[PDB]
Amino acid sequence: MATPDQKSPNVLLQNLCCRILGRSEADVAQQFQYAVRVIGSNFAPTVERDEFLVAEKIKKELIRQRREADAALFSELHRKLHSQGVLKNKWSILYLLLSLSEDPRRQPSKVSSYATLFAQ
Amino acid sequence: PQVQSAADETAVQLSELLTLPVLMKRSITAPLAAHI
Amino acid sequence: MIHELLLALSGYPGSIFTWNKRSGLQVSQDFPFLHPSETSVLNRLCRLGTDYIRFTEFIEQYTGHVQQQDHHPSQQGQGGLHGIYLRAFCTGLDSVLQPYRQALLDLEQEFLGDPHLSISHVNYFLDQFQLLFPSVMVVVEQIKSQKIHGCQILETVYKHSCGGLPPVRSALEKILAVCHGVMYKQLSAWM
Amino acid sequence: PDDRSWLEHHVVHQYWTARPSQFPHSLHLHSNLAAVWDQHLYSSDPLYVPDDRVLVTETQVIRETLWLLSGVKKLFIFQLIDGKVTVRNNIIVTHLTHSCLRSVLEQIAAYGQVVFRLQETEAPFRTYQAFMWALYKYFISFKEELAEIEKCIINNDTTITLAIVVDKLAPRLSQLKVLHKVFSTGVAEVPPDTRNVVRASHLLNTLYKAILEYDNVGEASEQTVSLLFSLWVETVRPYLQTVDEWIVHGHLWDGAREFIIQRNKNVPVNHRDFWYATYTLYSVRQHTMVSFLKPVLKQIIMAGKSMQLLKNLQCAESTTCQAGARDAERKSLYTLFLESVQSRLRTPKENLMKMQSIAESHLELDDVHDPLLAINFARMYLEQSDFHEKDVCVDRSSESVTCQTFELTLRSCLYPHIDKQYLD
Amino acid sequence: RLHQGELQLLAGGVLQAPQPVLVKECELVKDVLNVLIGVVSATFSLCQPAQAFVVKRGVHVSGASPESISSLLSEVAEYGTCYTRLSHFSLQPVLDSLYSKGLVFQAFTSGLRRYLQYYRACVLSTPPTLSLLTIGFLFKKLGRQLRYLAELCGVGAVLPGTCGGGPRAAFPTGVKLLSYLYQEALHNCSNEHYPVLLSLLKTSCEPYTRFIHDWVYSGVFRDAYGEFMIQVNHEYLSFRDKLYWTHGYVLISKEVEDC
Amino acid sequence: MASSSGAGAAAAAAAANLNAVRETMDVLLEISRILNTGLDMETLSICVRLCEQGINPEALSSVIKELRKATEALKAAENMTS
């Protein structure tokens, strides 16, 4: 039963680069190459491979940002996600979500325009 | 009358005034009592 | 979406407006094609739809089932809403939604006439029902929660008939009139 | 997504989404005023670091402003902080300076914050319910104009500017400001721990004083005077209803004990103090006297006492409970007052036959219609289909010079009728 | 379409969502009308064991989501299923000699045929220019009442094989029919079916009332199905003694409530 | 006659599973929002598919950061050219 054509991770990564840059895949070729280089690199194991430990780390991080309500909400959402059982790799997704969290309180160290020189 | 016309409204006037068991009793037993 | 929104308000949940047994009808998520203020308006409309859905669920729960001829009709009144007053209550709820259905049909006709209409026109037009429905839903939920039984539910409706909302007062008067018609029929039989 | 992206480009840009919609604009000095200001600022101060500004469309800004004025929460540009609408700092428009745009948006945000505070109203008590109802009617009236403005924007045939919209809303904005001040004084200035009766009495006194103020304000307040008169009528409606119930039935039905007179349940009718003690004014503070009723408060009290006595004296079934004019058929004190005020101010089987015709058009000739079944099917289908069963103009603007004073209008439309009922 | 694509991308191909087939309303109304007569359409297929229309998967309607449209169409299909199954249940036509439900039940089924004829007439009177939502709301009460009456009469639309509902009781006859009608009338006295239930009770009693007339006037038991409380044992009816009166015609006394 | 009835039940079970997945996805989106991950519905779905494919969260985070820097330079140029 023809499981929707989830294009291979290379095609998905190209589409992701195009989407993130807001340019066509052809316009993101340098960014696509950078992404391919990153993806082909050996990555260290995620800090936490326990769904509950990763969820607890996320809650602790939210509390550290003085987002205690957000920490409670995170713990509740994690419980709900664990009960839903839809994700096969809970530890990897939890580690990713933890890695992608941003502290609203820490004033963004505005990336100097000079970083764009190396993007080309 | 009961349910035998359309525009007619008296056909159900007893059915709205009287309950269906009481309506049926009144309707049936009077001729029944007369014949008995 | 406006037709989809009305369908959700008409009891057809979709991908945007999801029905949850616990939460009722709700907007499933924030969509990129709406301004967050538009998302807030949509969430308010989904609140109204949730109230409508809960009303429809109650209507089905107490009217949607054929009356089981359980030999003891008196015991039907305890667990399930039952009784001639319960049937009258469900009928009143359906009658009160009938004007709501008519307003929804008029909205549908208007949207068919003008595809460029926005949600603000609906929010203007539907605000009267956005105020009416929460109060009637609260009254019905109170009746259900307190297990008001028989004509004692009528007493609560009278207490609720003392509400301050003129439209809510009129709606409760219509429902009370139907229930009083049934009560008067029983009283006539007794007398 | 390609067709959706093309539509998204052509159905109006995601600028309302936090995704930066870059739109082409004219670089003309009159059209690039934001860009020209950026160039001058960039040229003028070597210490000047350019802040990140979000370019927003004028039509988009107008639409978001209308949505704010329509009472929409969670706007992208205007954020609500501590009940105060605040503009996101990184927003810029092509035709306005950041400071000018900020000033205009600050005025708009102040009005939006006022609306938001007014929008948050719950109605827990009969008087508060009436105030909420009046507020809802006012918000409806404002939303009507807002929807008409939105429709004109949607037609897009004509250039509508923010200034044009502001000018169109200027009378409504002034009415909103007056209403906001009046509401703040009548409700927001009321301490939270005040008794519902005390809150109501303070509101009523505020209403009377506001009525006097707006009557003294003259023609320029005509729309506001009309609003206040409608508000007064609505707020008295529960109070007038309670007065009517006391006068007609002799029973003070006050669940919240909001009326200035409370019945002492401890004084039976056969008690010597029944005439004196049974109904007690909530007189603990002299402030409990209703200023608008104060001129007639004594007559009201006497009428209520007489009706309470008659209903509380075990009267033989007195024929003077005439089956004639029901108190329900009697114009209510709110209804009688409204009718008298409008009149002084010159202010404001057949279904079976239809079912039979439907059957004749759709039933075969030989099938006898069953009248019980005919009625049932009529109700379920035809009466279901044919269910297309889908105001006190207290506007002083018409004859403000000829309109009596609020107290004079009350005395002439309500007080004469109240005195008549009391006398009877 | 975008949202459905996003949902499919999120579901990783496992939720094979039926492809949304966009159909014109000026066509959807025809399918709805066929459902109103219990007729299967291009979008609705008849499930033979249930005598019920089954919606074709992936029906998309313009201006509405295919899932929401499918929900609305599912409700309409449930109403059409009730109509078609009830028609089939009432379609038991002839009180032939093998008809064991008796003349009261046969007359009841004739009245039910009349009712279904009226329902068909109403459906045909519905102009095809009406909106789908308008039509749905207009017929919502009638469909609810029909379903309630079908469950009340045990002629519920649910297929007897697939509905794990217990055995639909045979339509009561004679005194059992009268007691069933009385209980339903008490329970449905507030429903739109109450006048209809009274009409059906009258129509079913008409053969029974004729039998009663013949019994009372001639002592003739005209009960063809044994619904009357009195049975005639002709061997003793020919007797010229007390036994003639006691055994020639015997009223079934033990189950007086049932007879 | 029975078989025609069965297909409706199979479709209903599949639809119930899909609705449960949709509810779970909405919950997941809310969780991501609470964590301030910055993913949009399309971006979140792409990340989920990639994450479903086993991508290392540290590698994914580094790739995301580099892509974000390149995307920010491109977005600044796109906003400057209009």
mmCIF file of C-alpha atoms in Angstrom, chain E residues 6 9-11 15 46-50 54 57 162, chain F residues 1-5 14 18 21 25 41 45 48-49:
data_model
loop_
_atom_site.group_PDB
_atom_site.id
_atom_site.type_symbol
_atom_site.label_atom_id
_atom_site.label_comp_id
_atom_site.label_asym_id
_atom_site.label_seq_id
_atom_site.Cartn_x
_atom_site.Cartn_y
_atom_site.Cartn_z
ATOM 1 C CA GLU E 6 0.867 18.482 5.143
ATOM 2 C CA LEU E 9 3.643 14.302 5.079
ATOM 3 C CA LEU E 10 3.373 14.223 8.867
ATOM 4 C CA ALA E 11 1.712 10.782 8.798
ATOM 5 C CA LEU E 15 -2.498 6.998 6.738
ATOM 6 C CA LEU E 46 -25.498 0.309 -1.039
ATOM 7 C CA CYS E 47 -24.203 -2.120 1.580
ATOM 8 C CA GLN E 48 -26.523 -5.036 0.819
ATOM 9 C CA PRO E 49 -26.601 -6.633 4.306
ATOM 10 C CA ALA E 50 -27.513 -3.281 5.847
ATOM 11 C CA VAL E 54 -21.921 3.583 1.804
ATOM 12 C CA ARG E 57 -13.973 7.107 -0.046
ATOM 13 C CA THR E 162 -23.915 -6.625 11.623
ATOM 14 C CA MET F 1 -24.434 -9.023 1.329
ATOM 15 C CA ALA F 2 -22.313 -8.908 4.453
ATOM 16 C CA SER F 3 -19.061 -7.988 2.776
ATOM 17 C CA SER F 4 -20.231 -4.577 1.651
ATOM 18 C CA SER F 5 -20.780 -3.629 5.287
ATOM 19 C CA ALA F 14 -8.376 3.716 9.503
ATOM 20 C CA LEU F 18 -5.671 8.985 11.289
ATOM 21 C CA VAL F 21 -2.479 10.737 14.625
ATOM 22 C CA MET F 25 0.515 15.824 15.827
ATOM 23 C CA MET F 41 4.209 23.114 10.245
ATOM 24 C CA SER F 45 6.867 17.802 9.353
ATOM 25 C CA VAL F 48 9.789 14.706 11.943
ATOM 26 C CA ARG F 49 10.268 12.710 8.758
#
